[PDB]
Design a binder for this molecule. Structure first.
Ligand SMILES: NC(=O)c1ccc[n+]([C@@H]2O[C@H](COP(=O)([O-])OP(=O)(O)OC[C@H]3O[C@@H](n4cnc5c(N)ncnc54)[C@H](OP(=O)(O)O)[C@@H]3O)[C@@H](O)[C@H]2O)c1
Ligand SMILES: NC(=O)c1ccc[n+]([C@@H]2O[C@H](COP(=O)([O-])OP(=O)(O)OC[C@H]3O[C@@H](n4cnc5c(N)ncnc54)[C@H](OP(=O)(O)O)[C@@H]3O)[C@@H](O)[C@H]2O)c1
Ligand SMILES: NC(=O)c1ccc[n+]([C@@H]2O[C@H](COP(=O)([O-])OP(=O)(O)OC[C@H]3O[C@@H](n4cnc5c(N)ncnc54)[C@H](OP(=O)(O)O)[C@@H]3O)[C@@H](O)[C@H]2O)c1
Ligand SMILES: NC(=O)c1ccc[n+]([C@@H]2O[C@H](COP(=O)([O-])OP(=O)(O)OC[C@H]3O[C@@H](n4cnc5c(N)ncnc54)[C@H](OP(=O)(O)O)[C@@H]3O)[C@@H](O)[C@H]2O)c1
Lengths: 280, 284, 282, 288
């Protein structure tokens, strides 16, 4: 069969829960940006596997609707907490409330982000600072405060940051996002080293484009990723099956980064007949 | 301090994937008779995969194949193969297709290593490691790949390298070079062979439990406070070779308890500094 | 001869200017943090090679002194401008003065930084934010503003960011710095790609420890680096000899990163006779 | 325009950068020294006073190049015939190098082979050929010189020329990508292991250098993938190589330097394809 058909047959999405039913029972999970997109998918999966989930972002309206929607789907409680992660006080309140309504988290997912697609010369200083504040400082603030509380309580936890494939390579047009996300990965590798002694491990997923265009022509797997596939990976990394995975950075991108970064991968449209000619 | 690590990084050694979830799947595992390869074969077999294992020593291979087979009730086939010989590799792939079918899962795990000052290695010793690790994975991949293209079938490929493949390391230089070559190949074929339904990933393991003071010292370099287990490694490998990971391609996953981030961080040696010392140094 | 002597003989520092005399004549360089340490070293060399340098940091006192000190040493004028790089208004005023007194820069060195060595638990959100602000946002604010000006003027420039070896790997105890520095490296690689069309190139040096005994044992070259050595590498990367070097990250660390990062490098104190024993056992 | 800015601001400086005679008294051993990049590097080092020894398979081209450079610089270049994949030839070659010139201060591993081909069309032997020349050849040369240098209590600066795809991998050049990646891991390993012997090891990863494309349109399309807007030159590469092999770089060890006009960062960046978007198009995307 042709490319598209091989890709569809051999890279078909498996969009159901992977981990055993109720495997996350008795675990508390905290997800920033848990009300939409990737955060929402991860919450849905964790809740449905029995985790007690707490989600936090700026828009209380969307947050409550999502918490209520997942709650009635899974039977398990999702708590919503309004929080701007770039404000240390709201963060401190948020963690205080987190611990009151659920208890110390076993799973912390740093997923809240902001992004502008723009030529960099059209960005104001404030536009840049906004992305940096939400992504990097926001993740630092949440990690610092939860980290401090866990040390005091002598409990550990699994941390996961969702970054991006361009965090490692950089990219034009998404520059403050690229910088801030790169900062997030270094933080994770840093705290994986520093905080092992406290029972805290830190890992990263770098996603490519998830269905939530013909960037597909740049994806060896021949489709966009799905939220449910990403969530399975996240759940695995935040589970006890992955208790020895620490400091890891995992690409979830259908092969996109290796494709675009490989110098001669622009020969991929060259036909059989054209190859016969080149070899002569 | 070691109680927090023991409680919070406790190994979970049972099968993580759903029972019988690899039914109808065929897995080919080089170096399948021992260590990490055995543990991976065991897990895949217990989840219903039909496994084929291949390496040089037939007696160990047969014993392992028989021992797993009676534990799981699913058949494991042994094939004698020196992966550095293209003819033997050809016969092996052919036999694999004959007795089990085209593989859905390919695991390149066969390896050799010397721990030695590089200046003590002969050219032959160097070339041996390169042949087994790099050319062998290549030969296996090339041949399975050609058959899969012919048959219009795809597969998930997995190579076990090491944390020093990315960084290099003194004393394991030929291994470091060959394993790095293995990683570049996976990334290369993830891009080239996606169009054929083949995806390619890599696990970089740290020290796995395979006077006892060296072991104790090794742990001091590990944030998770213990060595890894074979069963944990196999859960990760089975995950990567499962349809749950059908959009995972070109990935490199450290399985090391945090060891690489610890040793590679410039100021991580400051972990030995005590709280009372920190109080003094913060005043300065 | 022993290890120490081999290292001494074969890795000896050459602390003199490498590039041809007056090869930076007609070039203007802007160096943040150029009043102390590595910044001062780099200014001294670029000035001594004929560049018109402009240095910028918070403390006018030290900045004015350094500028006069280098100027009298080299004969070429070094302008000081007071600037907190985390304050975008000051950055805007600073770049405007740079262009007024010297001209559009040909060389831009982002070197201003701050750091705390501390357990991460002991950091306040403010302490964290301060490092992030100086290092990442400061470098961004300076680059944004100068870049905008160079695009408007249709001129290009070579940019250089001084980071560190732990920016790529992370490190405990220096976590806000590691994060901000990694951010700076991603920025450089991003703008190397985006701004090539405008004649701007972006490179990075990752230094190890520059002029304790504990490190020297982790440095294959067996000594700390010198400021003059680092300055030669920086000068090369900001020169027309490196006009095709863009998006590069160069470790300047005596081999330290490869040493500490390599799993079996802890075996480096094993003696010949122990190696005899180890081999026999296998 | 864009071509005017790039031409003006990324203009090649193709003359020697290091001080005249700065390599007098030094000996340099270069594999593949007779052609292309190796030749260019040999020429510069000779011109700065180094005694060069070049080695590869074809004695005819090698001897010609050696003579041609010697006459241009007045400094002797020795040719030695050697297949780097043959450990016995390598041993004889190093022994000759030491007898005719001395223990090398500079070692440049530049000999290579490559196929551009769908991986499916490669025989085992074709794959093995690339691995043997690039990885094993570099190892054999390094192993033998290293052993001699240790025995003599001398050190040296080692340099390997790889490629931008050694770190990323790449379809269509898979044996070469793998072997070159092995070469990089080797440099990093020996930077750590052999520092104690006074040996340092660095790498340059070149992008496309001005020495399949009969019309000239593939080259033109390659340039569109390069921020600097041109291909690199041999003389520029040679300048970077000489810097890394000079005493000015005596504290540079385990480093990997891209020399690529920004190509690798351009192609690796997910959203860099947005460089095609015009000012007017951006005016609408930002207005939403
Ligand atoms: N979707 C993809 O194809 C893709 C690809 C690559 C990477 N990613 C990464 O994956 C993550 C998820 O992104 P997404 O696509 O699901 O949604 P998104 O468009 O990135 O939305 C960001 C989320 O973060 C929250 N947020 C924004 N500012 C906040 C703040 N100051 N404080 C607290 N929360 C804040 C938002 O909720 P509120 O508005 O209520 O504050 C929202 O839920 C991001 O980190 C992104 O970088 C996604
Ligand atoms: N164990 C660890 O702490 C650890 C840590 C990091 C990475 N790793 C990696 O994990 C993998 C598994 O190693 P292990 O610890 O299970 O034990 P091992 O001693 O590395 O196992 C070697 C395996 O490779 C096979 N083999 C060797 N030469 C072969 C050849 N030429 N052709 C075919 N097969 C060959 C052996 O079988 P035969 O003898 O029958 O040929 C044996 O099964 C290796 O790739 C290793 O590099 C292990
Ligand atoms: N020194 C080493 O062994 C080594 C090792 C690794 C990395 N590095 C890196 O190399 C670079 C050189 O640092 P260094 O060691 O020379 O001194 P440093 O302490 O790292 O840098 C301080 C410099 O930055 C300026 N600065 C601080 N905050 C500023 C702000 N808010 N706005 C403007 N300027 C500011 C300071 O001047 P004012 O006080 O007047 O503001 C001073 O000149 C740094 O980027 C550092 O990260 C150095
Ligand atoms: N030019 C570029 O655009 C570019 C780009 C990326 C990387 N590179 C790298 O830069 C280096 C130089 O490449 P190049 O373009 O000058 O030519 P090349 O085709 O890459 O290298 C051929 C050279 O290697 C020698 N050689 C081949 N097999 C040998 C063997 N078995 N033993 C000893 N020598 C052998 C050849 O001499 P004999 O025929 O006499 O044996 C010739 O001098 C290579 O390592 C290449 O990988 C170049």
């Amino acid at each position: 069969m042709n490319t598209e058909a091989l890709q569809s047959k051999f890279f078909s999405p498996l969009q159901k829960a992977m981990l055993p039913p109720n495997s996350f029972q008795g675990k508390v999970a905290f997800i920033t940006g848990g009300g939409t997109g990737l955060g929402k998918g991860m919450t849905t999966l964790l809740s449905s596997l029995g985790a007690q989930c707490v989600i936090a972002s700026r828009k209380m309206d969307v947050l409550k609707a999502t918490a209520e929607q997942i709650s009635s789907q899974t039977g398990n409680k999702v708590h919503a907490i309004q929080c701007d992660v770039r404000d240390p006080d709201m963060v401190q309140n948020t963690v205080s409330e987190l611990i009151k309504v659920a208890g110390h988290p076993n799973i912390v997912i740093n997923n809240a982000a902001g992004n502008f697609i723009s030529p960099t010369e059209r960005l104001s200083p404030n536009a840049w600072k906004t992305i940096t504040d939400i992504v990097l400082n926001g993740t630092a603030f949440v990690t610092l405060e939860i980290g401090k509380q866990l040390i005091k309580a002598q409990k550990g936890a699994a941390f996961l940051s969702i970054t991006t494939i361009y965090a490692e390579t950089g990219s034009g047009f998404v520059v403050p996002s690229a910088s801030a996300k790169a900062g997030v990965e270094a933080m994770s590798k840093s705290l994986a080293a520093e905080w092992g002694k406290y029972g805290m491990r830190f890992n990263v997923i770098q996603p490519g484009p998830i269905k939530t265009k013909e960037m597909i022509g740049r994806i060896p797997c021949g489709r966009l990723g799905t939220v449910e596939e990403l969530a399975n990976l996240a759940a695995f990394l935040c589970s006890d099956y992955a208790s020895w995975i620490n400091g890891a950075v995992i690409k979830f991108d259908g092969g996109e980064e290796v494709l675009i970064s490989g110098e001669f991968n622009d020969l991929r449209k060259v036909t059989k007949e054209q190859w016969d000619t080149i070899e002569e």
